[PDB]
C-alpha cells in the first residue's frame, strides 16, 4: 500500500444498490422372528428421518418466526419517493409469486408445521415492522417514524452525516427503485439467483424417484423353500436402498441446516437491526434488509452503501490563526489544492472553516505540521454592518 | 402497525421502578467377592454425586466471585435522595435477612467452599463498587463519582439527554425509595418471589428423607443359607434407592446449573455494566442492578426506565428559512399543532428552534417535505438592544 | 472503597509504554500375521501424529493468515516522530532477527505449509496495513491516513479528546521510541520474554532424542525359536516408546493450540482493530498492536495508555447563573479549590466555563446541589469594545 505523511484518502461520491441473495431454509421431510428384526432396522432408519424432520421445522422457525405477534401495513406504496409496492403484500407480493412459479407402498410425505400462509404472515409482520417503525434491540418494534428518518440513522451508523440522505434523496430513491425493477425482470428472465433452491428441489425429487424405482404376490404363489429366499433378498436390498436414501437426505439436510443457520444469523443481525461488518449482508456498508418469502427458503434484498471515486487530499493536524492552535470540532482539515476546508471523514463535504466548527487548545509552537490559515467568526461582519 | 409519511411517535413521560427476581445458584451437595463388586457400583454412584458437588461450588464461584479483592463502604445511607440503607450491610442487610429467615448410616452432607461469610463479603464488594465507583470493562473498579453522575451516564446510554435525571431527581429518588419499601413488605408478607428457592430446598429435603426411609443384625442371627439372601436383597434395593436419589439430584442439578449460568450472565452483563437488551435485566430499559445474598441463590434488584404516554406529532426532514435548508444538530423537528420545536428522540422536550441548534446544508428547492418557519439567532436582539 | 457525595476522581497525567508478549503458535510436526497387526497399531499412532500435524498448520493459518492479499510499504521510517525502522522489514526486521538467532530409521520430520518466507509476507502485509491505512471491520484495509490521525481516533476510543495526542505528540513519540530501544536490548541481553518459545523447542528436541535412544541383524544370525522372541520384544517396547512419544506430543500440542487460539483472538481483536477490554492486549487501555514474526510463534508489541496521578476534586451537578440552570455540554464541573472549570472525564483539562460549552435547562430551585458561579458569553466584551 502507498503511503505519505500528509496524504489523506476521502471518497467524493457514492451509489446505492440492492443485492439479492437466496438462502435455502428447509428440506421436504419424509417418513417410511427375522421379519420383526428387520422391522427394528426400519425403525432406526425412520428415526434418522424423524430427527431430520424435526430439524427441518427447526430451521423454519429459527429463520422466520422471530416476531411473536403478526402485524400488517396500511395501503401505502410511496414512503418518500421509495417504491415498496412490489415487495409488499393470493395476497403475496408480485416478486414472491415469481419465486413460487419458477421454483403408496410405505412411503409417505409430511406437511410443514409452518404452512405457506403462516410463513407469509411472519414475513409480512417482519417487513411491516422494518419499513414503518423499525425493530428495537430486545423485544418488539420501536416507535413509528416516516421512513427517510429511519434511513438517516442508518447513514449515521456508517459515519455519514444526516444530510447526505436528504440532499441525495431523489438520487437514492431512483437508484433503489431502478434496482427493484431490474430484480423484477432478472429473476424472471435468467435462472441465476434461482439456482440454489431449484438444486435442492431437484435432488430429492431424484432421491424419491430412485428410492421407489429400486410380499403377498410371492407368498400366494411360491412354496416356503423358495418364497423365503425371494422375500429375504427383496427385503435386504430394499433396506439397503432405504439406507442409501436416508444417508442422502442426512447429508443434504446438513447443508440445509448450515444455510438455515446463516439465514437466521442475518435475520437477527441485519434484518431486525444493522450489520457493522462490511461485505456481509451485501457488498459495501449495510443500511437495510427486507425479507421475502420463497419455496423451501428465504430471500433477502439488501440495501447497501457503496463509496466511489476517491481523491488524494493534503492534510494537517491543526490550523494556526493568532498563534493559538485551532482543532476541528468533528471532522478533519484538508486542502483541495488552493483552499483549506473541513470535511467529515467518509465523504468529501468542503465546509468553510470558521470558529464555530473548531475549538482552541494549545499553540502554534507545540503542534507539529500546523499550517497558517484564516479562521474567522460570523460576529465581526455583523458588527461592521450594523453600525459602521 | 399504523403508519403515515409525516407521523412520529414520541414518549412524553416516564416512570422508574425496581424489579425483583430470584435465581437459584447452588444445590446442597451430598455424598455416600460380590460385596466388593457392589462397592464398585456404589463408587460410580458416588462419582456422579461428586461431579455434581464440584458443579455446585462451580456455580457459586461463577455467580458471586467476579471480584478479586473485597471492598467495604463508609457509613453512607444517603447518596443524593436515594435511600440505600436497607440494601447495604450479623452484618447483613435487612432485606437479605428476610430471605434467610423465610427460605448417620453412610449418608453425609458436605459444606460449601464459599461459606455465608465469604458470600456476604463478595456481595458487599460487588455492591460497594457498583454504588460508589462503578465497574469498568476489563478488570477492577473505575473512578470515584458522587452517584447521580453515574445515573446520568446510564440515562445517556438509553438515548436520554443528561438533564432528565437532574430535573426529575426528586421524582426518581421517591419512586426508587418507594419501590424498595414495597419490596421490603412484599417479600416478607406474600410468598411470591420467594418461590423458586423454597421449591429447590423442599425437593431435596424430600429426596433425602426418601433415601433414608427406603448388616450385623442379620449376620449375628441368621445362618449363611438365609443370611446371604436377606443381605443381597437389602443391598440391591438400597443400591436401587440410591440410583433413584442420584438421578433426582442430577436432574435437579441440571436445572440449577441452567439458572446459575443465567445469573452469572446477568452479573457480568448488567450488574458490572449495562445491558443493551430491552426487557432482559428487568422490564424496560436497564439502568442499574444491585445484587443481594440469599440462601442457595442470588437476588437481583433491577432499576429500569419505562416510557409512558406517547403522542402523535407532525414532523419534517428540515426547515426552510432564507431559502437555505436548516437541519437539526442533534434531534428532530416536530410540530405540537401550533408551533415547531426541536426535541430529542426518546423524550419530548420542546426546545426552541434557533440557529445554535441547527446547521445549514443544501437549499429549500432540493429537500423534500421542507416546511417554512423562522430560525433566529441570539445576536441581532443584542445588537438592537445594545445601541438602538 | 472510600466515598463522598461531592468527590470526583480525575487523572491529571499519563504515560504510554510498549508491552512485549510472546505467544507460541506451532509445534514441529513429525511422522513415523503378528507383524501386520503391529502395523495396524503403528498406523493408529501415526494417525494421532497426523491429526496433530494438521492442527499445527491449522494454528499457523488462524494466527497469521488473516489478510488475503499481501502488501508492502514504501521506505518510510519516520511517521510523525515515531521511529518504525526497527520493526519494519534477508529482508526481515532487526528485532525479528534477534528472535530467530536466540530461539533415518522410520522417523521423519515434516515441513510447514507456511514457510518462513510466507509468514514474513503475511506479517509484513498485516503490519503495512496497520501503520499506514488501518484495517476496517469486515474485509480489507480502510483509507490512507498520515499516522497521528490514526492514533487520534484510538485516543478518542478511550474517552480522551483528540487534542491530547497532538499536544503531547513529542512526549508520546519519545516514550514510544524509548520503549522500542529498550525492547531491542532487553530481548537480546536477558532470557526473559524469550522463555516460552525456547521451552517448547527444548521439549521436543528432548522427546525426539528420547524416542531414538529408546530386524535384519537378528534374522540373519538367530534361528526362528530365538529370533522371534528378540524381535517381538523389541517391537513391543518400541511401540510403547512411540506411544509415550505420541502422548507427549499430543499433550504439548494441546497447550500450543490453547496459545494459538489466544494469539488468533488478539490478532482479530486488537491488531486488526481495537480492544475495549482493559488489561488484555497489554496493561492499561489499548491503542495499537504491531505483530512480529518469530520461530514457532508470534510476538506482539502492544502500545497502551496508562493514567497516572489522580486528584480529589469537588464537583456539582450544575451551575446557577441568572436563576437558570446551566448544564455541561460534554464534560463535568469541578473545582480546583478556588475556581470552577469544565473538564472531560478521563483527563484533567481546566477549560474556562462559558455559555458556549453549556446548555440551559431547568432552574436553580429544582436542581439539587447547584452552585453559584459566573457563566459568561464571548459577545458582550466585543460589543463593549467595538462601540463603547
Ligand atoms: C460513480 C458515481 O457515483 N457517479 C455519480 C453520478 O452518476 C451522479 O450523476 C453524480 C450526481 O452528483 O454523482 C456521481
Ligand atoms: C404515567 C406517568 O408517568 N405519570 C407521571 C405523573 O405521575 C407525574 O406526577 C408527572 C410529573 O410531571 O409525570 C407523569
Ligand atoms: C508520572 C508521570 O506521568 N509524569 C509525567 C512527567 O514525566 C512529564 O515530564 C510531565 C510532562 O508534563 O507529565 C507527567
Ligand atoms: C411503483 O411501480 C409501479 C410499477 O410496477 C407503478 O405502477 C407505481 O405507480 C409506482 N409507485 C410509485 C410510488 O412510484
Ligand atoms: C493517490 O496516490 C497513490 C500513490 O501515488 C496513487 O496510486 C493513486 O492513484 C492516487 N489517487 C488518485 C485519485 O490519483
Ligand atoms: C477549491 O475549492 C474552491 C471553491 O471553494 C474552488 O474555487 C477551487 O478552484 C478549488 N481548488 C481546486 C484545485 O480545485
Ligand atoms: C514528511 O516527510 C518529508 C520527507 O519526505 C519531511 O521533509 C516532512 O517534514 C515530513 N512532514 C511531517 C509533518 O512529518
Ligand atoms: C505563520 O506565520 C508566522 C508569522 O506570523 C510564522 O512565524 C510561522 O512560522 C508561520 N507558520 C507556518 C506554518 O508557516
Ligand atoms: C431510609 O429509610 C429508613 C426507614 O427504613 C429511614 O429511617 C431513613 O431515615 C431513610 N434514610 C434516608 C436517607 O431517606
Ligand atoms: C396515533 O395514531 C394511531 C393510528 O391512527 C392511533 O391508533 C393512536 O391511538 C394515535 N395515538 C394517540 C396518542 O392518539
Ligand atoms: C405548543 O406549545 C406552545 C408553547 O410554546 C403552546 O402555547 C401551544 O398551545 C402548544 N400547542 C398545542 C396544540 O398544544
Ligand atoms: C404523504 O402522503 C400524502 C398522500 O396521503 C401525499 O399527498 C403527501 O404529498 C405525502 N408527503 C410526503 C412528504 O411524502
Ligand atoms: C416558503 O415561502 C416561499 C416564498 O418565500 C415559497 O415559494 C415556498 O413554496 C414556501 N415553502 C413552503 C413549504 O410553503
Ligand atoms: C530510528 O532509530 C535508528 C537507530 O536504531 C536511527 O539511526 C534512526 O535515525 C532513527 N530514525 C528516526 C526517524 O528517528
Ligand atoms: C482522595 O480521598 C481518599 C479518601 O480519603 C484518599 O484515600 C486519597 O488518598 C485521596 N486522594 C488524594 C490524591 O489525596
Ligand atoms: C485553580 O486554577 C487557577 C488557574 O486558573 C489557579 O490560579 C489557582 O491557583 C488554582 N487553585 C488551586 C487551589 O490550585
Ligand atoms: C452530602 O453529605 C453531607 C453530610 O455529610 C450533607 O450535609 C450534604 O447536604 C450532602 N450534599 C449533597 C449534595 O447530597
Ligand atoms: C445564589 O444566589 C441567590 C441570591 O441571588 C441565593 O438565593 C441562592 O441560594 C444562591 N445559591 C447558592 C447555591 O448559594
Author numbering:
A (entry chain B), B (entry chain A), C (entry chain C): 705 to 736, 751 to 807, 813 to 826, 855 to 965, 977 to 1150
Study authors write:
S comprises two functional subunits, designated S1 and S2, that interact non-covalently after furin cleavage during synthesis. The receptor-binding domain (RBD), which engages the ACE2 receptor, and the N-terminal domain (NTD) that recognizes attachment factors are components of the S1 subunit. The S2 subunit contains the fusion machinery and undergoes large-scale structural rearrangements from a high-energy spring-loaded prefusion conformation to a postfusion state, driving fusion of the virus and host membranes and initiating infection.
To understand the specificity of S-directed antibody responses elicited by vaccination or infection, we evaluated plasma IgG binding titers against thoroughly validated prefusion-stabilized SARS-CoV-2 S trimer, the S1 subunit, the NTD, the RBD, and the S2 subunit (fusion machinery) in the prefusion (S2(Pre)) and postfusion (S2(Post)) states. We determined a cryo–electron microscopy structure of S2(Pre) which is presented in more detail in Fig S2-S3 and Table S1. Vaccination with two doses of mRNA-1273, BNT162b2, NVX-COV2373, Ad26.COV2.S, AZD1222, and Sputnik V resulted in greater binding titers against S1 compared to S2(Pre) and S2(Pre) compared to S2(Post), whereas infection or two doses of BBIBP-CorV resulted in greater binding titers against S2(Post) compared to S2(Pre) and S2(Pre) compared to S1. Prefusion-stabilized vaccines therefore elicited comparable or greater prefusion S2 over postfusion S2-directed antibody responses, relative to other vaccines, with the exception of NVX-CoV2373 which was characterized by low S2(Pre) over S2(Post) antibody titers, possibly due to the vaccine formulation or later timing of blood draw post second dose. Although prefusion S2 antibody binding titers positively correlated with neutralization potency, postfusion S2 responses did not, indicating that antibodies targeting postfusion S are likely weak or not able to block viral entry. To obtain a quantitative understanding of the relationship between S conformation and plasma neutralizing activity, we depleted polyclonal antibodies using prefusion S, the S1 subunit, prefusion S2, or postfusion S2 from the plasma of vaccinees who received two doses of mRNA-1273 or of BNT162b2.
